[PDB]
Amino acid sequence: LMGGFGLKHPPPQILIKNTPVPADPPTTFNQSKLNSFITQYSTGQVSVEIEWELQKENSKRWNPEIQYTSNYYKSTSVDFAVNTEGVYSEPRPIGTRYLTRNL
Amino acid sequence: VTQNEGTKTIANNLTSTIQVFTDSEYQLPYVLGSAHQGCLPPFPADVFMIPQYGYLTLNNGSQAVGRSSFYCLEYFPSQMLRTGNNFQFTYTFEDVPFHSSYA
């Protein structure tokens, strides 16, 4: 209902955690689980490649259609670009329904 | 037909043609199935006149919206036919459920 593709077997969930690394344990055995750990965090890169199948438009319409276009008028800052502080922002929500087709 | 001086004269033009195409790609507004008139009559003895094709698009009252499309039928590959030429066309129905003709 929120849009998208309903899948019975969607991309699985990739779960990840940092393996615990205990701090120096007592020098005498204590049955209690170790609660002291070395503080750490991990970083790194992640890539995600998706192949999409398209269905090209074969419109035999005569007059021009409605395309999504960045309005030609001059602005302070380009749309879908970083401002003067390096903060990227998407100004409006873009849908897909632009091209028309008969019913 | 050449109507001169109240007297109507109808003579055959052997060099004149007619264009006839079939939209096999369903790129034009489908009008059949709206239960309109202009069918081959039920009785085989009589001759009928062919209905005029016209289509509708989106509207906002009597006006046209942005998505309203204009389809030129001359923009499709027709097949000019003089007297002596014929048009043949075959079609095979997809798999549709039998019509239950029983109570």
GROMACS .gro file of N, CA and C in nm, chain A residues 58-64 66 97-102, chain B residues 26-29 66-72 75-77:
model
   84
   58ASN      N    1   0.654   0.318  -2.636
   58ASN     CA    2   0.630   0.311  -2.780
   58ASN      C    3   0.510   0.399  -2.823
   59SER      N    4   0.492   0.513  -2.756
   59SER     CA    5   0.379   0.602  -2.785
   59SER      C    6   0.371   0.648  -2.929
   60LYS      N    7   0.253   0.630  -2.988
   60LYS     CA    8   0.224   0.667  -3.126
   60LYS      C    9   0.138   0.794  -3.125
   61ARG      N   10   0.146   0.867  -3.014
   61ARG     CA   11   0.074   0.992  -2.992
   61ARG      C   12   0.132   1.094  -3.089
   62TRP      N   13   0.058   1.200  -3.121
   62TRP     CA   14   0.110   1.299  -3.214
   62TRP      C   15   0.174   1.418  -3.146
   63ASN      N   16   0.104   1.482  -3.053
   63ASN     CA   17   0.158   1.599  -2.985
   63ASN      C   18   0.253   1.557  -2.873
   64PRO      N   19   0.339   1.649  -2.828
   64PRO     CA   20   0.436   1.623  -2.722
   64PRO      C   21   0.378   1.580  -2.587
   66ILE      N   22   0.432   1.501  -2.147
   66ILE     CA   23   0.470   1.575  -2.027
   66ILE      C   24   0.593   1.511  -1.965
   97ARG      N   25   0.472   0.855  -1.282
   97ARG     CA   26   0.365   0.883  -1.377
   97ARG      C   27   0.371   1.015  -1.453
   98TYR      N   28   0.455   1.021  -1.557
   98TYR     CA   29   0.466   1.140  -1.641
   98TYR      C   30   0.415   1.111  -1.781
   99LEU      N   31   0.465   1.002  -1.840
   99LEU     CA   32   0.424   0.960  -1.973
   99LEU      C   33   0.280   0.911  -1.967
  100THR      N   34   0.202   0.938  -2.072
  100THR     CA   35   0.063   0.895  -2.075
  100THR      C   36   0.045   0.779  -2.171
  101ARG      N   37  -0.063   0.705  -2.152
  101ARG     CA   38  -0.095   0.589  -2.233
  101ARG      C   39  -0.247   0.571  -2.231
  102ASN      N   40  -0.305   0.514  -2.336
  102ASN     CA   41  -0.450   0.494  -2.338
  102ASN      C   42  -0.497   0.387  -2.241
  129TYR      N   43  -0.267  -0.193  -3.050
  129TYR     CA   44  -0.357  -0.125  -2.959
  129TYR      C   45  -0.302   0.009  -2.914
  130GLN      N   46  -0.247   0.084  -3.009
  130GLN     CA   47  -0.190   0.215  -2.981
  130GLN      C   48  -0.296   0.325  -2.991
  131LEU      N   49  -0.412   0.291  -3.047
  131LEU     CA   50  -0.523   0.385  -3.061
  131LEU      C   51  -0.631   0.358  -2.957
  132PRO      N   52  -0.711   0.460  -2.923
  132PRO     CA   53  -0.817   0.438  -2.824
  132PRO      C   54  -0.911   0.328  -2.874
  169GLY      N   55  -0.360   1.868  -1.948
  169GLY     CA   56  -0.226   1.850  -2.000
  169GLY      C   57  -0.204   1.715  -2.067
  170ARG      N   58  -0.253   1.610  -2.002
  170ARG     CA   59  -0.238   1.473  -2.051
  170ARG      C   60  -0.326   1.434  -2.169
  171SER      N   61  -0.416   1.523  -2.210
  171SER     CA   62  -0.503   1.495  -2.323
  171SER      C   63  -0.415   1.468  -2.444
  172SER      N   64  -0.436   1.354  -2.510
  172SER     CA   65  -0.355   1.319  -2.627
  172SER      C   66  -0.430   1.332  -2.759
  173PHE      N   67  -0.355   1.360  -2.865
  173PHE     CA   68  -0.412   1.373  -2.999
  173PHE      C   69  -0.345   1.266  -3.084
  174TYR      N   70  -0.426   1.175  -3.137
  174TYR     CA   71  -0.375   1.069  -3.222
  174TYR      C   72  -0.415   1.091  -3.366
  175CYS      N   73  -0.316   1.101  -3.452
  175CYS     CA   74  -0.340   1.118  -3.594
  175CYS      C   75  -0.341   0.976  -3.650
  178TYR      N   76  -0.091   0.862  -3.925
  178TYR     CA   77   0.045   0.837  -3.881
  178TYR      C   78   0.071   0.688  -3.861
  179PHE      N   79  -0.017   0.605  -3.917
  179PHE     CA   80  -0.004   0.459  -3.908
  179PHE      C   81   0.007   0.406  -4.050
  180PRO      N   82   0.074   0.290  -4.069
  180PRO     CA   83   0.088   0.235  -4.204
  180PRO      C   84  -0.038   0.170  -4.263
   0.00000   0.00000   0.00000
